[PDB]
Every structure is written in C-alpha cells, then in structure tokens.
Design a protein around this ligand. Structure first.
Ligand SMILES: CC(C)(C)c1nc[nH]c1/C=c1\[nH]c(=O)/c(=C/c2cccc(C(=O)c3ccc(F)cc3)c2)[nH]c1=O
Ligand SMILES: Nc1nc2c(ncn2[C@@H]2O[C@H](COP(=O)(O)OP(=O)(O)OP(=O)(O)O)[C@@H](O)[C@H]2O)c(=O)[nH]1
Ligand SMILES: Nc1ncnc2c1ncn2[C@@H]1O[C@H](COP(=O)(O)OP(=O)(O)CP(=O)(O)O)[C@@H](O)[C@H]1O
Ligand SMILES: Nc1nc2c(ncn2[C@@H]2O[C@H](COP(=O)(O)OP(=O)(O)O)[C@@H](O)[C@H]2O)c(=O)[nH]1
Ligand SMILES: [Ca+2]
Ligand SMILES: [Ca+2]
Ligand SMILES: [Mg+2]
Ligand SMILES: [Mg+2]
Lengths: 437, 309, 63, 424
C-alpha cells in the first residue's frame, strides 16, 4: 500500500476533518481511544486502511492528519472532544490571531510566521510513511485561513513533495450560511494560486448541502453539524477506494487519470443518493435503478448546475451496499435513453463502476437513516463552470468599485494580484466553454 | 409585491408584458443588473442561466427555456429531426432538408436562393395551396406558450402572412411571390390589411372554396407537429425539479400544400405578435406563465394526448 | 454495451461499461512573501512618519 | 483575539460608559462589588473580553476613566456600579476644559495624556491577546472631543495593528450645552476619519426625538437619552460577549462592515424602544430596527443607500423566521441596498435576552445617508466660521484659523465621498 496524509486548514477544513475521521473510525471499527480489535497485526501493517491510519506499539490507530488553524478555539474542541486520544498533540497546530476573512492576511501576513512550522509537522508524518502517495487538503474558499494559508501550503507542498499528488476538498461559499461579505474575493484569489498545484478538487457548494438538509432530512435551519455529517458521507464515498480492498481508484494518481484528462479542468461534480431522514417512520428502500437515476437529478448534486447543458469528460459511479454489476448495467441502459448525457468527442461515452458490499455507515444519533444501498457519482461535467460564473460575477461587481480592497493591500498584497487572479478565472471559464460547446 | 427585470429592449411582446405587470400595483420593475428579482425578461444571446435560482428566499422565473435554441436555429432543427427516434428521417410533416457548411426545386437559407443549381438546403414546396381571388402563396404563424410545468398552450388566434403577387413556377428570381414575409412585402395590402388574414376569414374561405374547416383540414396537423416537437425536447429543457423555472413563447411557421397537408418551416425563439393580437396574447402570457407562479390578489388550447399502445 | 475489466474481491467489485467509443521555486516564494512584508513595513513607516508630524504640530501649538 | 480595553473620556463619555458597565455586568451576573452571582456558564465563557480576574474570584472591568476635571468621575465612583472599577484607572486633571477642543487636544489634555497611556499599557500588558480598543465620548465638549481624539491618535502610534472603535455622541442644538459644539465636532470628525476603524454616530438630535415623539417623554433628561444609548452599546457587543458558534472578533467584523477605509461611520438602531408586557414578533423587530424613527443618527436611510448592514437578534425565536424577515425587507426594498456588494446584510441570533425585554434587535447600518449628519454640523460650523465667531477661545490656546479651514474641508470631502457611492 501507499500512505495518504490529510490536511485540514481553517474552521471549515477542521470541522469537516472531525466528521470524516469520526466516520472513518466507525467504518473501520476503530474506537475513540484508538484501539481496533479486528486488527490482528499489532504494531504495524500494510492493509488498505493503513493508507489513512498509522500504528503504534500499544495498539493505537492514529490518523495521518494535520489540523491547521490561525486561531485556537475550533481545534481546541478537537483537543477536548470525543476523539482527543485519537490524535497526537503535534498534529493539531494553532496560532493566536486569525485571518479576519482576509486572503492576504492568511497568505502573506500570518501565513509567513507559521508556514515553516506546519511543513515541519507534515514532514514528521511523511517520514512515518514507507511510500507516500500525497495529500487530501480540506478547506473553505471563503475564509482567510481557508483561502489564504491553504494556497501558501499548496505552493510549498509542490516544492517539498514534487512527485506526490494533491487532492482538494473545497467548500464553496453560500450567503445563506456565511457571515463573510468578501468571500468572492477570497475564493477567486485562492483558486488562482492553487490551480496549478491541485491535481483533482471536489467542490461542495454550501447552498446545495443546505437545501438537501432542508428538503431530504426535514431540518428547518441546518447547522454546520448537519452539513458536515452529510459532507463527510460524500467524502467517505470518494475516499473508500483508498481505504478498502478494490480495483477502482486504488491510488491518488488514478483519480486524476479516471476523472481529469484536461489538467486545468480538475473539478469533478459529486452527486449523492439517497439522503433519507432517520426521523422518517416509514421508508420504502430504493433500488439500484432509482438511486443511479437520482445521480442525474440536479437537487442531489454537491453544486447546483445543469449537466444537460454541458458535456462529460468522465463519469464514475461508486456504490455502497447491496449492488451487483447487472443491476447497474440495466439501470445505465434505462437512463441513457431517457436523460441527456452528451460526452465530448475525444472521450469514450462510458462509466467506471466501483461497488463495495458494506452499506454506508451512519453516525449514531445522526440525521441520516440506515440504507440498504447508496451511490456517489463523480462526473467531470462542464456544467460546473456555472459555479465559477456566479463567483466571477460577484467578484466583478465588488472589484469595479474597489470595495474592501484596502484591507488586502494593507496586508502587503498588490492590487494587480486581483485582476491577475480574475484573468486566470476568465481563461478558466473560456476553457470550459471550448470543451462543452 | 413581486419584482422583475427587463434585459431585451427590442422585444415588442415583453414590452407589453412589462407594461401589463406594472399596471397592477403588485409588480415593481428593478434595474437591468439587480439580482433580487422574481421574474427575468431576458436577453436573446448569452442569457446567464447559471446565475438564476441562487438567490435565497426568491422563487425565480425566466421567459426563456434553456436549450430551446436546438429547435429554433435552422441547422439544429434539421439535425434534431433526423437524429431523434420520435421524429426520424422519414418525418411526414417536415420538408426534406440537408446540412452543408459555409420536380427538383430546393431552397437555401440560414439572402435566400431558390433554384436547381446553387446553411441548410431544403426541398421547396412546388405546388402550395393558393388563396383566391389572387392565386397567391401564404404561411401560417401559430403562437405557442410552454409554461413552467411544460403545459403546451396553443393560442387560438394565428395569422396567414400572405403574398400579394400571383405565384409563378418559371420565375424564381422574383422574391415577392415566393417569399411571404411581412418585411419583404412592405400590392402591399390589396386583399387584406398589411398582408394578414386572420383565422375567422381563413376558416370561411375553406368552407366556401374547399367545403372543409381550418380545425380539420390544417389545425389538427399543426397541433400534432407542435406537440411532437416540444415533447421530443422535454427531457433536455424541462425545468421540473430545477432550482429555477422557465417558460417561453414560440412562433411556429407553417406551409399548407394544394392537397391540404401542413409542413413545418421554422420554430422561432423570440417571436413578435401581430399588431391586433398583442393585447390578448400578452395578457395570456401574464395569466398562465407568470401569475400561475406568482399569484395576484380561456384564450389558449392545451395540447395533451395519451393514446395507449 | 460491453462490460470490460471486471475485477472481484470479498468486500466488493468493480468494472467499466462503455456505451460508445470516441510551479515556482523555494527562492521565488520566500522572495515574494518578503516583498509583501516590505510594502507592509513601508506603509507602517508612512503612518509613523505622518503621526510624527502631528506630534511636532502639537508642540508648535502649545509653544 | 479576546481582550478589549475600554476608555471613557469626558462628562458624556463617562456617563454613557458607566451605563455600559451597569448593563453588561447585569447580563454577566457581576454584582456592584465585583463578585459573580449568575447561573449560566455562558455568562463566564467569554468574560475575559471585558473583565480581568482578581483575587477571591472578583471581576474587574478592563476600563480606563479619563476626564480633565474630577466632578463627573467622582459621580461615577459614587454611582451604583462605581466600586467595581480599578482605582488606579481613574486618571484625572483639575482645571477642566471649558467645552474647548484646543484645551482637550493641545494644552490641558496634553499635560494629562501620558499618564492615561501608562494605564492603557498596564492593561494591554496583561492581555493574552488584545483585539483592540473601544472609546466612549462626546464630540461637542472639550475633554471627550479634544482629549479623546488625542488619545486615539496616541494609541494608534503605540498600537498601530489593533482595532479602534468608538461610540461618539454627536451634538445638536436641541440638546446643546454651548454654541461652539459644531467647531469641536468638526475638529473631532477629521480625527476619526483618519484614526478609527468603526465609529457609532449617536446623535443627540435623534435620541431626543425618540424620547419626545416615539416615547412620549415631554422633558427628556440625559438619563432618558443614555437609556437608549446603553441598549445599543449592549447590542453591538453581544456577539463578542457570548458564543453562539459565531467565530468573529473586532477585525473580522470590521473587515465585513467597512468597504472603504474613511467611510466607517455607522447608523445605530434598536427595537423595541423603551423607557414591556407584550413581546414583539420577529416581523415587528425587523420593521422597527429598519424604521427611520428607531435610528440613533438623525438621517433618513431612504436619502442614501446601504453599503453594509448587520443585525443581531436577542432572545428565543425561530432562526427560520429571522432569515425570512431579513430577506423580506431586502427583496422588497432592494434599491436602498447597493447591488455592487452582494449579500451585504448579515445576521446573528443570541439566545440570552437583555434585561426586561423577551426579545430585541440591534441594528448596525453603514449607510451613505450619514452624510446628512455631517452636512448638518458642516452648516452650523460655517454659519459661525464665516464671521470667525467664538474663535478667540481656540486661538488663545495656540490654534490657527488654517486648522479650522482644513477641518471644514476634510469633512466636506467626506460628504462628497459618501455622495459618490450613493449615485454609483
Ligand atoms: C454576523 C454579525 C451580525 C454578528 C455581524 N456581521 C458583521 N457585523 C456583525 C455584527 C457586529 N459588527 C461590529 O462591527 C460590531 C462592533 C463592535 C463590537 C464591540 C464594541 C463596539 C463599539 O464600538 C463599542 C461598544 C461599546 C462602547 F462602549 C464603545 C464602543 C463595536 N458589533 C457587532 O455586533
Ligand atoms: N460546510 C461547512 N462550511 C463552513 C464550516 N465552517 C465555516 N464554513 C464556511 O466557510 C466560510 C468561512 O470560512 P472559515 O473556514 O470559517 O474561515 P477560516 O478558514 O477559519 O479563516 P479565518 O476565519 O479568516 O481565520 C463560509 O462560507 C462558511 O459558511 C463548516 O464547519 N462546514
Ligand atoms: N420548403 C419551402 N417550401 C415553400 N416555401 C418555403 C420553404 N421554405 C421557406 N419557404 C418560404 O420562405 C419564407 C421565409 O423563410 P423561413 O420561414 O424559412 O425563414 P424566416 O426567417 O423568413 C421566417 P421568420 O422570420 O418568421 O422566423 C416563408 O414565409 C415561406 O413561405
Ligand atoms: N447623550 C448624552 N449626551 C451628553 C451627555 N453629557 C453631555 N452630552 C453632550 O455632550 C456635549 C458636551 O460635552 P461634555 O461631554 O459635557 O464635555 P467634556 O466633559 O468636556 O467632554 C454636548 O453636545 C451635550 O449635548 C450625556 O450624558 N448623554
Ligand atoms: Ca495492523
Ligand atoms: Ca497646567
Ligand atoms: Mg477562522
Ligand atoms: Mg458638559
């Protein structure tokens, strides 16, 4: 096997880390203290789960995780929480003063005085690896630490670890759960500087997760805890092939090969069905056909957009539960003739299916019901550029007036970096249109 | 108090819809680039469909169906009909057309060329139905409203855009007898006002001259073509379950031949109404398309047919 | 519709179904991190230069 | 970033500043002698923001009390919560400042300023992470106006990276001690444009009208004006003094409220206005806090446009209903919110209500209509200044007519700058 280091930057990154590592623990049967009874090789191993967990002599299973935040209060809840014994204190790095929703403060000002420490703590985990694959980076587009410090990390990770792959789990800003007004700036700035350093990135629009939590879980006003537990299900689905026995998406390089032919266009859409409420008394369990068919409904996507007005370069159906190949092929046969699934000319019109017989694990006292079978479709569709267009339009309105810009410039950043970053995004929108129209 | 924005100043149809909405006291117009609207009366080219349905606490509606251009451009319409199973190459109501990039009479179009020597190249209807007295060609325009639910509403009033010149088989270069467009004519208004024969008169002519009705001889075929065309594209363009909603007014252009067979010529995405009918159609657009989605404090005929087989 | 490269195991299986065929250096980063710190320190200097002039005007009024 | 250092300067500054520590000490369960007698752990969870911990588990406000005469500071110490303040932080001169900016800024206050900064340094030293400073003062008198702005300029020199926020009471002929207030206010406004990150424009005109028209008090005292002020001071400090999953400090809030550095003068507001039995519904709070009648700065928000708005709702209510109502006023009055700052109205809810009210709402508006306030003081200034009237009081303390001409021009520039974004 080959090891994977997960990095959680900023509030959003950290709290999404918590949810994932909680879920990974329940999936592999690892307990809060870190013992795993079903693991028989005590002290080490090269099993599939060892890609994400290291081992000690006492029998503890320790996440290959680094938590980074420019203020302590969120990572303090990890130090005092249910999974406090799980982590070594050196993995949990905190500063004193945050980035105040300012890219420039996170990247340049406060970024500089902590970047060398963080890479050192990352190097302490890489040296425990017999053969490092690379990194899973969790952060928000909207925050100053999430946007700013993440892009500085990704720049350095390319220098220190040039042979390794880097995957992103990005939270794209939604006004309905954000109190920051300057997120459009932060999101474009970090997307510009992270683009050449990120091999494959999974965007999650907080708008889509929020409305899924309203519509499908019957939750009136979804909290971050409601959103994060749902996100971490999608994340787990995506990373299950790295952690379990299988032949699809077995390493980080294969995510790029299967999903990303055109390197700049490395933003695959995630769709996920079924999301069903635990409070629901009567639920008729959904079939392979029904949940595969749900992967092409916009209301289940991680980013709201219309795949019909766009083209695919790659599709991947990752199933969890009672599913067999012929049910999947029969579902795909039905769906091809009903729905509008147009591929690009140079790509084969096809699906890479991955099935794991273990059904999705649900967090005790959570919002999600137990299900017989579920699926996460990962499709590289040009329709996701809809999200860039929205972000770029918001950017253009504010930036035309130079609104808020002085805060960025006052932290050492040059005004030219704004229009420089917007021009990359202007090209990115153009790249998507060439491919998809 | 709902809100709308107007992003098409040329649109003679939605100027009247804008006026009718304002003259109620329950619809305020906003600026062209304000995001906080309920209704977008949008531009023809490059309408930003990606920015719709992302403003929290606002149900958003637009007056264009995205992807409906695949019915309305001539090149795409020909490619749609040949490739879709439910229309097919052997389509009885569409003239034989071919695509080449920039009785054996054809017509070229996208500067219109009608010859045998020589965009799309379409089979020209050599023996059309000719009105009398006049011995002259026409085309029929039918207005079609598809709402947010995909109810296909045909407007009861259509119009025959007539040629005023006698039709000539030998003389092709003379455009005024072959091409029946309103701009190309303006004998402009010899037989009827502005070369526009409405449905009441055209029914009566068919009764007197042919012993049949508009409803039977022609309109049954029009309803079948409209319904077949839109239900074909329903999976591609429908806004059911979608985060924003769409309607659209289409204009269907038809040709009736000597043996009373109806042929589809063109579908139009941004059609204009005839001068008399604006007031009724635009009130119909408000009642059915807008007021169904946004309720305040029948002129159409619904096209539905579920034959079991 | 062809079902290729079917691989099975005890915890799952995978396959493919085809419907139809067809970086700056460590020098430059640490350089431009510091270039922003020069603009940060020049801007704070311009402020303490401006505030120093206020201090001498304060002395001039009382004198 | 947790600790805030509070400074109150002058008669007005010390009066409203005393009321602030009265209101929040009640909210945090701290008695007149400094001991805790609450019930919720939420009352002590972020008590370090405004209080230092002392021996015997006593809580002492991180508060410095400044004045150029003893009078008002003797009244603070005698008053209900006066015993809680650290005696070393009472810093005072003897001769007063006779409602004279020059005395405050250049002569009398210059003699006292350095000993105030020694107490600031003493408080700032034993602060784990100082987030910034907050100041209470009037701009109409001498001490709070002249010395308060002098302190603000000195604090910025020694702490250039910390946030400086002020509650600045604006003078009005309706509540007027002296004819020279416009002079003192104009000189002070130029200081705040340069040296503060946020300034809450409490207009005594507005507080009077709210007491007269919308509360039916015929003869309103300063206590009736200060009652309205303290309700707002509590409201704007709620999200720092409690949780509730809000991860924001003074800088983070400043970054989201101030799109242009000079335009940081806010229009405060409160619902319901008091001097009750029936608790307000969420729709009423929303309509009242956006209503011109409830504005603490006498401007008509319809005469400008909102750059940003912040609203913090207190009490046990539906967050769904808050979202709905806040979205209702924006989408039904979208002309008055600038289209070129998307999603510029942000909201928070706190479960703990203030004393007396079952649910309230505090309004923080950065509107371009605040130019009306600065135009009004500019008109009063020029009425006197064109005849150099009452200038001898200022030239006697060393000032030149040039400094007035500069300050006149600096505030008229601010007005022009607000007009630029109102038409854009
Ligand atoms: C998401 C949400 C709604 C929370 C939000 N999103 C953007 N903003 C907000 C809200 C606030 N934003 C602020 O900038 C703010 C400023 C603040 C804080 C503390 C003190 C003082 C202050 O000047 C003071 C008070 C008493 C005193 F004696 C002297 C001075 C100002 N308070 C807020 O509640
Ligand atoms: N889904 C999700 N989104 C979050 C969470 N926490 C914050 N966000 C979103 O992230 C954006 C704000 O960024 P944060 O991650 O809070 O900021 P940060 O990275 O801590 O950076 P600074 O606050 O600038 O130090 C907003 O869009 C929030 O809605 C979370 O736990 N889950
Ligand atoms: N195959 C055919 N046989 C006979 N007449 C035809 C024809 N194709 C086109 N025409 C005639 O040419 C005229 C105009 O051509 P067409 O309808 O293709 O484009 P157009 O753009 O002018 C219609 P509109 O402007 O209303 O959308 C029609 O009114 C019709 O009478
Ligand atoms: N709202 C309010 N305004 C006050 C109070 N005391 C004084 N003022 C106003 O402040 C100005 C006078 O300044 P003052 O603070 O008395 O002078 P200082 O002691 O020299 O700073 C006038 O405009 C008064 O209207 C008060 O307690 N409340
Ligand atoms: Ca092992
Ligand atoms: Ca003296
Ligand atoms: Mg943060
Ligand atoms: Mg006084």
């Amino acid at each position: 096997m080959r090891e994977c280091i997960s990095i959680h930057v900023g509030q959003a990154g950290v709290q999404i880390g918590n949810a994932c590592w909680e879920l990974y623990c329940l999936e592999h049967g690892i307990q809060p203290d870190g013992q795993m009874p079903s693991d028989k090789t005590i002290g080490g191993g090269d099993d599939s789960f060892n890609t994400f967990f290291s081992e000690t002599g006492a029998g503890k299973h320790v996440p290959r995780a680094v938590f980074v935040d420019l203020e302590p209060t969120v990572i303090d809840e990890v130090r005092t929480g249910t999974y406090r014994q799980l982590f070594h204190p050196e993995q949990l790095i905190t500063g004193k003063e945050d980035a105040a929703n300012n890219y420039a403060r996170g990247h340049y000002t406060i970024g500089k005085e902590i970047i060398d420490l963080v890479l050192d703590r990352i190097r302490k985990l890489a040296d425990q690896c017999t053969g490092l694959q690379g990194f899973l980076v969790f952060h928000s587009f909207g925050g100053g630490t999430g946007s700013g410090f993440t892009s500085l990390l990704m720049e350095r990770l390319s220098v220190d670890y040039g042979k390794k792959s880097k995957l992103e789990f990005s939270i794209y800003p939604a006004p309905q759960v954000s109190t920051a007004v300057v997120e459009p700036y932060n999101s474009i700035l970090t997307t510009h500087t992270t683009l050449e350093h990120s091999d494959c990135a999974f965007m999650v629009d907080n708008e889509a997760i929020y409305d899924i939590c309203r519509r499908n879980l019957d939750i009136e006003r979804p909290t971050y805890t409601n959103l994060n537990r749902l996100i971490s299900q999608i994340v787990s689905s995506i990373t299950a092939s790295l952690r379990f026995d299988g032949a699809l998406n077995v390493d980080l390089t294969e995510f790029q090969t299967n999903l990303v032919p055109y390197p700049r266009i490395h933003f695959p859409l995630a769709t996920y069905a079924p999301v069903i409420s635990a409070e629901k008394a009567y639920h008729e369990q959904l079939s392979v056909a029904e949940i595969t068919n749900a992967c092409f409904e916009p209301a289940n996507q991680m980013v709201k957009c219309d795949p019909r007005h766009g083209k695919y370069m790659a599709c991947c159906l990752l199933y969890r539960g009672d599913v067999v190949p012929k049910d999947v092929n029969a579902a795909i046969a039905t769906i091809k003739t009903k729905r509008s699934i147009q591929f690009v000319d140079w790509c084969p019109t096809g699906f890479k299916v991955g099935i794991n017989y273990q059904p999705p694990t649900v967090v005790p006292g959570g919002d999600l019901a137990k299900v017989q079978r579920a699926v996460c479709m990962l499709s590289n569709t040009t329709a996701i550029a809809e999200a860039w267009a929205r972000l770029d339009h918001k950017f253009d309105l504010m930036y035309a007036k130079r609104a808020f810009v002085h805060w960025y410039v006052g932290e050492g950043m040059e005004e030219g970096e704004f229009s420089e970053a917007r021009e990359d995004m202007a090209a990115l929108e153009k790249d998507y249109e060439e491919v998809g129209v | 108090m709902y809100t709308f924005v107007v992003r098409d100043e040329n649109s003679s149809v939605y100027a009247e819809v804008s006026r009718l909405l304002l003259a109620t006291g329950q619809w305020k117009r906003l600026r062209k680039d304000n995001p906080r609207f309920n209704l977008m009366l949008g531009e023809r080219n490059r309408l930003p469909f990606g920015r719709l349905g992302h403003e929290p606490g606002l149900v958003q509606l637009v007056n264009y169906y995205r992807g409906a251009d695949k019915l309305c451009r001539k090149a795409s319409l020909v490619k749609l009909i040949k490739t879709s199973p439910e229309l097919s190459e052997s389509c009885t109501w569409f003239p034989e057309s071919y695509v080449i990039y920039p009785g054996n009479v054809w017509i070229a179009k996208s500067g219109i060329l009608i010859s045998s020597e020589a965009h799309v190249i379409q089979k020209y209807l050599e023996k059309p139905l000719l009105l009398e007295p006049g011995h002259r060609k026409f085309d029929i325009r039918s207005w079609v409203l598809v709402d947010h639910l995909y109810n296909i509403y045909l407007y009861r009033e259509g119009v025959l855009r007539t040629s005023s010149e006698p039709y000539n088989s030998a003389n092709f270069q003379d455009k005024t007898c072959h091409l029946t467009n309103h701009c190309i004519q303006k004998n402009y208004g010899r037989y009827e006002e502005g070369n526009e024969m409405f449905f009441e008169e055209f029914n009566q002519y068919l009764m007197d001259a042919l012993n049949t009705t508009l409803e039977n001889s022609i309109l049954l075929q029009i309803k079948h073509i409209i319904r077949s065309c839109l239900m074909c594209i329903e999976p591609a363009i429908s806004t059911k379950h979608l985060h924003y909603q769409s309607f659209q007014l289409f204009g269907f252009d038809f040709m009736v031949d000597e043996e009373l067979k109806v042929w589809l010529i063109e579908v139009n995405g941004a059609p204009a109404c005839a001068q008399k009918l604006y007031a009724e159609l635009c009130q119909g657009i408000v009642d059915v398309a807008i007021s169904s989605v946004f309720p305040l404090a029948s002129i159409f005929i619904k096209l539905h047919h579920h034959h079991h087989h | 519709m062809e079902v290729i490269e079917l691989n099975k195991c005890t915890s799952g299986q995978s396959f493919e179904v085809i419907l139809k065929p067809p970086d700056p250096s460590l020098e430059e980063i640490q350089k431009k991190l510091e270039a922003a710190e020069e603009r940060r320190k020049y801007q704070e200097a311009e402020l303490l230069k401006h505030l120093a002039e206020k201090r001498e005007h304060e002395r001039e009024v009382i004198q | 970033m947790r600790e805030i250092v509070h400074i109150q300067a002058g008669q007005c500054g010390n009066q409203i500043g005393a009321k602030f520590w009265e209101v929040i000490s009640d909210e945090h369960g701290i008695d007149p002698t400094g001991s805790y007698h609450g019930d919720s752990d939420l009352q002590l969870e972020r008590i370090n923001v405004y209080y230092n911990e002392a021996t015997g588990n006593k809580y002492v406000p991180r508060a410095i009390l400044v004045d150029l005469e003893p009078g008002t500071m003797d009244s603070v110490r005698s008053g209900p919560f006066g015993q809680i303040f650290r005696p070393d932080n009472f810093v005072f001169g003897q001769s007063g400042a006779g409602n004279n900016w020059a005395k405050g800024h250049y002569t009398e206050g210059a003699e006292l300023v350095d000993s105030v900064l020694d107490v600031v340094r003493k408080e700032s030293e034993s602060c784990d992470c100082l987030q910034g400073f907050q100041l209470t003062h009037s701009l109409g008198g001498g001490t709070g106006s002249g010395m308060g702005t002098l302190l603000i300029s000195k604090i910025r020199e020694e702490y250039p990276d910390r946030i400086m926020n002020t509650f600045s009471v604006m003078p009005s002929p309706k509540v007027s001690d002296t004819v020279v207030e416009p002079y003192n206010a104009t000189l002070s406004v130029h200081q705040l444009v340069e040296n503060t990150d946020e300034t809450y424009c409490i207009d005594n005109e507005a507080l009077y009208d709210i007491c007269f028209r919308t509360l039916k008090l015929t003869t309103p005292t300063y206590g009736d004006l200060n009652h309205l002020v303290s309700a707002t001071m509590s409201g704007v400090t709620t999200c720092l003094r409690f949780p509730g999953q809000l991860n924001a400090d003074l800088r983070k809030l400043a970054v989201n409220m101030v799109p242009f550095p000079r335009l940081h003068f806010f229009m405060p507001g409160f619902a319901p206005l008091t001097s009750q039995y029936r608790a307000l519904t969420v729709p009423e709070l929303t309509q009242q806090m956006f209503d011109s009648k409830n504005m603490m700065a006498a401007c008509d928000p319809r005469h400008g446009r909102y750059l940003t708005v912040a609203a913090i709702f207190r009490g046990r209510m539906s967050m769904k209903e808050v979202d709905e109502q806040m979205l209702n006023v924006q989408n039904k009055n979208s002309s008055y919110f600038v289209e070129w700052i998307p999603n510029n109205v942000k909201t928070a809810v706190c479960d703990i209500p203030p004393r007396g009210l079952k649910m309230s709402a505090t309004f923080i508006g950065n509107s371009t209509a605040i130019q009306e306030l600065f135009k009004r003081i500019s008109e009063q200034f020029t009425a006197m200044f064109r005849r150099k009237a009452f200038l001898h009081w200022y030239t006697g303390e060393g000032m030149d007519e040039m400094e007035f001409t500069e300050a006149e021009s600096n505030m008229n520039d601010l007005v022009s700058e607000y007009q630029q974004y109102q038409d854009a």
